[PDB]
Amino acid sequence: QHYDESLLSRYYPESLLKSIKLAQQTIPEDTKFRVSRNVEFAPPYLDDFTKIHPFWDYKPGMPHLHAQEENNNFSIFRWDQVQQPLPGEGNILPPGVSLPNDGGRKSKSADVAAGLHKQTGVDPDYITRKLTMKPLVMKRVSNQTGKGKIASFYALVVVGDKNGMVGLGEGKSREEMSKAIFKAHWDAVRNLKEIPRYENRTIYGDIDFRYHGVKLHLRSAKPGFGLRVNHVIFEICECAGIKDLSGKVYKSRNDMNIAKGTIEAFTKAQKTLDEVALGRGKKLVDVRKVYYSS
Amino acid sequence: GNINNKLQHLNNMNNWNTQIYNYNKNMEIMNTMNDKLINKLLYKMMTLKLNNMNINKIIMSKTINQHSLNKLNIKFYYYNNDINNNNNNNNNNYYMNMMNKLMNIMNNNMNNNLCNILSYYYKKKVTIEPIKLSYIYLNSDIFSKYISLNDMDKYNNGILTNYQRMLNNIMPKLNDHNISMNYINNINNINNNKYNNMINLLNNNNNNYNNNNNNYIGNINNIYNNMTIDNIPMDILMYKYLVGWSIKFKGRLGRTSTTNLLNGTFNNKKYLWSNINNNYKLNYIPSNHNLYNNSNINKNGKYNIKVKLNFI
Amino acid sequence: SADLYMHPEKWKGLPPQRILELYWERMARLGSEYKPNKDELNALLTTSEYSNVPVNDIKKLYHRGEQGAIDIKGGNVNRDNSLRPFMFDELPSQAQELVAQHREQRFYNRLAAYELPLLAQYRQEYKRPSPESHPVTYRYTSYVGEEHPNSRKVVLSVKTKELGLEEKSLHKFRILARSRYDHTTDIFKMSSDKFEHASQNARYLHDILQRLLAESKDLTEDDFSDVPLDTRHTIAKSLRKKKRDYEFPEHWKRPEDAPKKKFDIVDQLLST
Amino acid sequence: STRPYPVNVEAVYYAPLKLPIKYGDLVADIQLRSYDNENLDFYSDFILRTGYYLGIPLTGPKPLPTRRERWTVIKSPFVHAKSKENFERHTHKRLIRAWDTNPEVLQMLIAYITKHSMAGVGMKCNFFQRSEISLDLGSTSAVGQKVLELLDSPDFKKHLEK
Amino acid sequence: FRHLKTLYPDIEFVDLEEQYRLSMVEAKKRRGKGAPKKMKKDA
RNA sequence: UUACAGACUUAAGCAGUGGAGCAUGUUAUUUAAUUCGAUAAUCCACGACUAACCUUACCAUAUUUUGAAUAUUAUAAUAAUUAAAUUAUUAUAUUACAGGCGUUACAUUGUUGUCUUUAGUUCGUGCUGCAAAGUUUUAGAUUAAGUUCAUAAACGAACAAAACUCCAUAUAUAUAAUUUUAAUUAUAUAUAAUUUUAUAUUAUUUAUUAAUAUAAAGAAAGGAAUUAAGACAAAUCAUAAUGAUCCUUAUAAUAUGGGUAAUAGACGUGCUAUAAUAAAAUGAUAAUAAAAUUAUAUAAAAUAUAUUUAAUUAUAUUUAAUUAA
Ligand SMILES: [K+]
Ligand SMILES: [K+]
Ligand SMILES: [K+]
Ligand SMILES: [K+]
Ligand SMILES: [K+]
Ligand SMILES: [K+]
Ligand SMILES: [Mg+2]
Ligand SMILES: [Mg+2]
Ligand SMILES: [Mg+2]
Ligand SMILES: [Mg+2]
Ligand SMILES: [Mg+2]
Ligand SMILES: [Mg+2]
Ligand SMILES: [Mg+2]
Ligand SMILES: [Mg+2]
Ligand SMILES: [Mg+2]
Ligand SMILES: [Mg+2]
Ligand SMILES: [Mg+2]
Ligand SMILES: [Mg+2]
Ligand SMILES: [Mg+2]
C-alpha cells in the first residue's frame, strides 16, 4: 500500500522519509510480492528498522565487519565491561530456575523438613523447631568389589521432641558423612513414634527386653534420680523426654542394636496404668500421687 | 526453520577460523598463513606487567578472521580478571589500566595502531574487535587456556579436592528435558500465531481471475501481528544454556597420569522430539559440542588440558 | 566536535560524563604520546562529585596511574573469582555468534529498507548502442578485492558478417584469421593478456583488428579466392562437445489425442 | 489508524523484485564463490535488491556446478598407512547477470556491493562493452633485454668477431 | 615481538616463551650443567 | 569347577599367492658411506603422494665459529626528538648463549595401530536384612544381532546408546531472458519409509500374535557419521613440541663430489607373460562415460621429420582458445 507523505511523516523520522518517497515512486502499487522459500532475508518478526536496538543491533562506535565508521573514528575507549548487556530483564534465567544469589545458607533441618512435608505431609514447622537430632553411630563401612574396596559412611541418629515423640533413623552415603547424617535425619523423622511415659518422666515399672544379642534391663526411678544408663540409652532418653531411669546392658553392647532395642522396648514392653486397668476391669492407684492429693 | 533462521543455527562459515574465498589461490594461502602468524603474535601481547609482582595475564581465544571483499575483521574473545583495582570506588574512571591500554592500541591509537601495521601486511583495511567474556567457562578455548596456564598449582600434585569441587558447582544442574520441551512449545506457539493471523486475514478478505495466481495475503502488520523484537528473538535463540562440561588432565603432573572430570549432559533432545535437525561442524563435531585443548610445560614436561562444553 | 578531546581548555562547562569521556579519548588516541595537562586535571577535579572520588585521590590517580590506585587500595590481593557461579546474565560465546549473525542480518535489512531506495536517484535510461554501428564486443574481467593476473586479459569478439566487408574481402579476412574464426557461428574472437594493464591489451587487439581489416580490404595483389576456408580447427572442437541434434518426428505427432479442456460452470460463472 | 508499513520496508520481507529485460544486451556477469552456501545466497539476494533500485535488470542467482576438492591423509604421524582419513572442500558458485544498463550505473552497483560484502565470499565480474570497429586513440620483455646486453658483453663479443 | 618495546613504549609486554628459556638457562648454570665457554677464533 | 549362549571357528564359489622374468620393499653381506626407523598378529610400494644435484638425515675433502633467536653493554652510520645532548633505525663488536635427525616413546604432549567390554555405570527415592549388604520376577521372551517386547518392591533421573541426523534415491517449489546448454542439467529449500494394509496357513504366552504365503498401495532397495572404559608401560623424540643427560673449533654451519641404486642366499608386495570361451590389426558425417585438472598453467589446429599417398605413433616448429557449466 502507498501512503501519503502526511501519514508517513507522523510515524517515521524525517531522515527516512526521502527513502520512503523514492520507494513509492519505483515500486508500482500493483506489485504482487512473492515469498521466498530458499533464502530468509527478513527476520522472523515484524520490524520497521527505524530504531537501533541496544542488543540485537551492532553497537554504534564498536569495530566489526560491517562498521561504517573510519578506523580512526571509533568511540569505544573502555574495555572493562561487557559492551552489550542482555536485553529486557537483563537475564536468561530459565522458567522455573532461581538465581543462586546466596550459597551455603541452607539449613539441613529445613531441607529435611521441606522434603518430608512434600513426600509424607508432616508439618515443616514442627520438624525445624520442635525436634532435636543427636548422632549415635558414625562410622565407615566398606564393600570389597572387583574394582576394589568401596567405602561408605554410615550414620545412626535419633530425633525427638523431648515430649514423648522419638524416632530412630539410619543413613548411608558413599560421598561424605554429612550426606549420611542427612539421610539418617530424614529416616528418623519418618520413624517418629510416641512412647508411653509415667508422669512424663520415666517408664512404667521395669523392663527386661531382649533385642537380638542385647539384653536390656531397665528400671523406673524416683523423681530427680536422673539418667543412670548406657550412654546410647542416655541420648535416646534425652530426645524422648525420659528424665529418670536406671538400667544395665548384658551380653552384646553393640551401639546400633542397643538404640534399636531401646526404642522397641519403650513401645512393645510397656503398658500404661490405664491400659492395665481397662484390660483387667480394675482400678490402679498411684499411692505416692494420692498421698499428696487434696 | 532451524537452518533458515540466523538465531537458530550456527552458520557453517563460523566453523572455520579463516573466513575467506579468493579466486587467486596463492593469495588465499598467504592470507591463511598471515592469520596463523598474527594469532601467535596476539597470544604474545596478552601477558602484561605493571611491576615485577603485578603480571596480568589476559586469556585470549583463537581469532576469527572475517575476510570480505573490502576489509578484514579480526574478532576474538578475551577474559581478564581485574585483580589490581577490584573495588566499589570509581577510581578506575581516572586512569587506564594495562588492559585498557592494550585494547586501545588495536584501533584507537592515532600513530601506531595495530590495525594500520596489519593493513600493510595484508594490503587491505583491517579492524580488530575484542569482545569481553566475564566467565572463563563460556568459551572452551579460554577455559582450557586458564586451567593449563593459571591453575597449575592446583593439579600439579593431583587434582585438589577443592579444585574439582569448584569445577563441579560452576553451573546449576539444569533439567535439559524441560528446557528442551519449553523451547519446542515456544516454537509451536509462534508458528501457530502466524497461521492464525493469516487464516483470519484470509477469512476476512483482507478480480476472481487474479484470485488464482497471486499469493499476497495482505498487510505486513496483520500477518506478523503480535510478533515483535521483544518476544520472538530471545525465545528462539539456541545454545543459550550450558548443560554439560568435561575437563580432562594428562601428562606428568615418573609416569604420565590422566584424570578425567565429567559433569552434566553431552547431548541435545531438541533434535529428537522435533523436526529440527542437528548439524556437524567440519562434518565431524556436533554443533552443540565445543572442544578445545591447551598444553603447557612444567618441571616434568608437557601436560594437556582437554575441555569440552555442551551448550543447548 | 571530533577534535574537542585535543583541546582540554574547552572542556570547562561540559557535563561530568562528557569530561570523563573526553579524558578517556585523549588517553586512548595518544597512548605513549600522552602528557598530563593542567586544564585536563582541572576539569577532572570538577567530576569528583559525579564519581564520588575524593578530590585528593583524583590528583594522585591522574599523576600516578594504576600504581597509584593500587596504593589507594592498600593491597593487590583480590579474590580469584575465576570459578564463580553463573548468574544467568551473560550468553555463551557460541550463542553470541548466533546473535552476531542476527546483528548482521538486521544491518542488511536496514540498508535494504532505507539505503537502497536512495539509489533510485542515480537511475539512467539505457542509451543502447546501435547493433550495426557497434558490432565489436570487448570483454573485460575484474577480480574484486584481489590481485589476479587474469584481470589484465581482454577479449575481442565480432561477427564477420557485421564488419561491412565485401564478398572477396570477407573471404580473405576469414582465411587470414585461421583458428580465430568459427564458420559455424561466424564469430571472430581473439584475446590478449600479453601486457600488464587491460587498457594496453585492449588497444593491442584493436590495432590488430585494424591491421587485419586493412589487409583484407587491399585486394590489389592477392585475394586468396583460390584458397578455400579451412575449418579443421572448428571440427576438432565440435568432436569434444556432445551434439543433441535430434528432434521429435513431425509425422508422429497426434494432436487429436491431446486432452480437451472441460467446461466448468463455476469458473464460467465466476467470470461474470 | 495502525502504524503504516511503507513498501520499502515491506519489500524486505518478500523475494527481491526484478526488472524486465527489454533488449537483451548482456552487460556484465557477476560470479560469486564461497566455501559455504549460506552467506553466498544471502549476499546474492542483497545484490538483486541493490540492482532493482538502480534500475538494472538482473537475472539469477543461477547456481553453477559445485566444485569438490578432496585430500586423503594417513591418520598416524609415522606409520600405519592402512587407516586413511578423508577431507574435502566445496566451492559454491552463483551467477548474476546484468542487462541493458549503462556502464556508469553498472559501476555504481559493483562499488556498493563491494562496500557491503560478506565474509568468505569472492566475486569475479566480466564486463562486456560493445564498440565500433574503428576507434579514436585506441581502446621489450625482460629476458629479451638481458640477452642483448649479454651478447654485447666482452665474454660474448670476443667470439662473435668475424 | 622485539618491535613492540619501541612501537608501544608505554606498555610492558612479557614473552613467556623467552622468559621460560632464560629460567632454564639459569637453572642449568646452578646445577653445573651450563654451556662451555665458546672458543675464540683469535686463539 | 558346572551348564548355557555367542561368536570362534570349515565348506562352497570367483580370481589369486606360492613356479619364470622384471618392478619394488626387507633381510643378510659388502662398503669411505651403503642415513635412520618400522620390522608376528598390529613391519616388509611402511614412514615415502616421486632419493641424478636438491631432497639428506650418511661418507670423503675443504671451509665457517655469538652462528637463525632474545637480551645486555660499547662503537659507529642515519633519522627524529630535545637545546649539542637525548631517542629510532641499521651495521659491527661483546657474553649469556644460539644450534644439535645426539641419547632416552619404558620419563612426556599429541596422534595412531590392535583387540576387547560398551541395555551398562553412578545418583535420588522407596523397600528387605540387627547389620556388612541386597533390591530380588529372571538362568523372561524374541531377533542375525539391543534386535524387539514383556515383567518383578521397586520407581525415576543422568549420562554409555539408539535414534535425531547427513549422503544417496523419489517427488515438489524456486532460480536460468535454455548461446557458460548438460533443462536428459545445475543447487538451494521442503516432503517421503524404521514402509503400510487385507486374507489364508502353520506355530504360539492362540490373541488385538509371530513365522509364511497371497492380494493391494508405494520410487523406496544402500550407506556414513553417531561415544564410554581398559589393555598391550604396542608405533612415533624422524611431522612438530617437553624434561633429564651429552656435544659447543663441533655431535653445530656451508660448499664440491660420492652414497642411500652395492649383490651370495632368503622373505613380502606387485607387474608382464606361458595363444584360439584369445591375442593382433582396421573401423571419420567419428558407438557409449564418470570424476577431476589448468596464473609456480592446460595446450588445439596446422606444418616439418622419423616416413611411405594418407592415417597411426613419437618429437620438433608454431602457441589458437581458456584461468574455465
Ligand atoms: K647426475
Ligand atoms: K616399547
Ligand atoms: K538404593
Ligand atoms: K538446453
Ligand atoms: K645420489
Ligand atoms: K594370446
Ligand atoms: Mg593467445
Ligand atoms: Mg586431435
Ligand atoms: Mg569443454
Ligand atoms: Mg612373486
Ligand atoms: Mg650434498
Ligand atoms: Mg644426495
Ligand atoms: Mg638447548
Ligand atoms: Mg647432524
Ligand atoms: Mg533396618
Ligand atoms: Mg622402537
Ligand atoms: Mg631406499
Ligand atoms: Mg562419439
Ligand atoms: Mg596436434
Side-chain angles (χ1 to χ4, degrees), chain A residues 66-128:
Chain A
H66 302 287
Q68 298 305 313
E69 301 92 353
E70 295 302 322
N71 292 14
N72 60 353
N73 195 12
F74 290 119
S75 67
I76 310 301
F77 309 106
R78 313 296 290 186
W79 306 85
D80 295 339
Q81 296 299 320
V82 170
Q83 306 292 4
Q84 289 185 271
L86 291 185
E89 302 178 4
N91 61 53
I92 51 164
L93 189 57
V97 179
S98 63
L99 169 53
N101 284 310
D102 291 327
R105 297 182 185 186
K106 295 178 180 179
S107 174
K108 299 296 183 181
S109 176
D111 185 2
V112 164
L116 286 176
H117 174 74
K118 165 179 158 173
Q119 175 176 282
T120 69
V122 289
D123 172 42
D125 297 350
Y126 175 86
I127 303 176
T128 61

Side-chain angles (χ1 to χ4, degrees), chain D residues 18 23-24 31 33 37 59-68 70 75-83 92-95 97 124:
Chain D
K18 287 178 181 177
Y23 301 101
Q31 190 181 120
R33 295 186 181 184
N37 69 272
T59 53
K62 182 189 198 293
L64 298 176
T66 297
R67 181 190 170 183
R68 182 182 60 174
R70 285 173 281 172
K75 305 162 190 194
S76 157
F78 170 61
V79 288
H80 306 110
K82 308 170 187 179
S83 58
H92 304 270
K93 307 170 144 200
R94 300 290 188 276
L95 178 62
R97 266 167 170 185
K124 173 203 188 183

Side-chain angles (χ1 to χ4, degrees), chain A residues 12 18-19 40-42 45 47-52 55-58 66 74 78 84 86 91-92, chain C residues 24-25 28-29 87-91 100 102-110 114 117-118 120-121:
Chain A
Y12 291 79
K18 175 175 177 180
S19 306
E40 183 63 12
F41 184 71
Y45 55 91
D47 200 307
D48 57 8
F49 301 106
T50 62
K51 302 174 182 179
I52 300 307
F55 175 86
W56 292 114
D57 281 323
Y58 289 113
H66 302 287
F74 290 119
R78 313 296 290 186
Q84 289 185 271
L86 291 185
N91 61 53
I92 51 164
Chain C
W24 299 335
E25 180 175 1
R29 289 269 163 69
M87 306 314 258
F88 294 73
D89 54 342
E90 194 175 29
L91 278 162
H102 188 62
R103 287 183 181 119
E104 180 178 52
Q105 181 177 30
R106 295 175 53 76
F107 163 89
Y108 278 106
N109 301 144
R110 185 173 289 101
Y114 298 105
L118 296 166
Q121 287 176 121

Side-chain angles (χ1 to χ4, degrees), chain C residues 108-222:
Chain C
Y108 278 106
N109 301 144
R110 185 173 289 101
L111 290 181
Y114 298 105
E115 293 302 322
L116 295 189
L118 296 166
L119 296 176
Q121 287 176 121
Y122 308 111
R123 283 183 166 193
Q124 309 181 6
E125 183 178 2
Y126 183 44
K127 184 178 179 180
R128 192 188 183 189
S130 76
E132 311 80 3
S133 79
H134 292 65
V136 181
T137 292
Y138 289 82
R139 190 197 74 177
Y140 298 85
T141 299
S142 170
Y143 294 88
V144 182
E146 287 181 57
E147 315 308 301
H148 195 301
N150 190 65
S151 63
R152 74 197 51 179
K153 188 176 182 179
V154 173
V155 185
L156 184 161
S157 54
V158 63
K159 298 271 183 174
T160 55
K161 280 175 277 179
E162 310 191 2
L163 290 176
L165 290 173
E166 302 303 332
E167 179 183 302
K168 273 185 166 295
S169 46
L170 181 64
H171 179 60
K172 183 175 182 181
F173 180 105
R174 290 169 182 179
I175 292 291
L176 290 172
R178 297 192 69 179
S179 65
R180 297 170 196 91
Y181 178 64
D182 182 359
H183 74 298
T184 301
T185 69
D186 193 60
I187 301 168
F188 167 77
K189 190 180 61 168
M190 51 173 186
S191 57
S192 74
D193 52 301
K194 186 176 62 171
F195 301 106
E196 301 296 63
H197 305 87
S199 61
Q200 273 179 84
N201 281 305
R203 181 179 180 172
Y204 179 73
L205 295 162
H206 171 268
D207 292 1
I208 286 174
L209 177 63
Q210 305 317 296
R211 210 194 310 174
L212 177 62
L213 285 172
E215 184 69 57
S216 303
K217 296 155 72 175
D218 168 60
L219 305 191
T220 65
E221 168 179 58
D222 199 356

Side-chain angles (χ1 to χ4, degrees), chain A residues 23-62:
Chain A
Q24 283 186 172
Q25 295 172 5
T26 55
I27 308 173
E29 294 169 10
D30 195 8
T31 287
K32 288 294 171 182
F33 280 110
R34 307 181 173 180
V35 177
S36 178
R37 287 170 290 190
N38 257 7
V39 181
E40 183 63 12
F41 184 71
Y45 55 91
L46 185 56
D47 200 307
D48 57 8
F49 301 106
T50 62
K51 302 174 182 179
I52 300 307
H53 201 277
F55 175 86
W56 292 114
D57 281 323
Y58 289 113
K59 184 171 184 175
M62 183 79 193

Side-chain angles (χ1 to χ4, degrees), chain A residues 269-289:
Chain A
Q270 279 194 101
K271 262 178 180 184
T272 61
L273 298 200
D274 296 353
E275 173 283 340
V276 165
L278 288 171
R280 289 174 54 186
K282 295 289 191 181
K283 181 178 173 177
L284 278 70
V285 304
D286 173 27
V287 182
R288 170 174 56 82
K289 162 176 174 183

Side-chain angles (χ1 to χ4, degrees), chain B residues 6 9 11 14 23-24 54 83-84 86 90 93-94 110-111 134-138 146 208 287, chain C residues 23-24 29 33 47 51 66 73 76 78 81-84 86 89-90 94 101 105 146-147 270:
Chain B
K6 313 301 200 194
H9 80 277
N11 187 324
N14 292 312
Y23 280 79
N24 185 1
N54 282 14
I83 293 169
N84 278 21
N86 194 318
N90 298 327
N93 299 359
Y94 293 96
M110 291 301 309
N111 290 17
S134 62
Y135 305 83
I136 70 179
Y137 47 80
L138 292 172
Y146 189 78
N208 291 1
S287 199
Chain C
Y23 169 61
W24 299 335
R29 289 269 163 69
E33 312 161 2
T47 66
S51 71
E66 193 166 0
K73 181 173 162 185
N76 208 64
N78 175 63
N81 56 304
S82 66
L83 291 186
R84 66 178 187 175
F86 188 56
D89 54 342
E90 194 175 29
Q94 188 176 359
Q101 291 166 206
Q105 181 177 30
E146 287 181 57
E147 315 308 301
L270 287 168

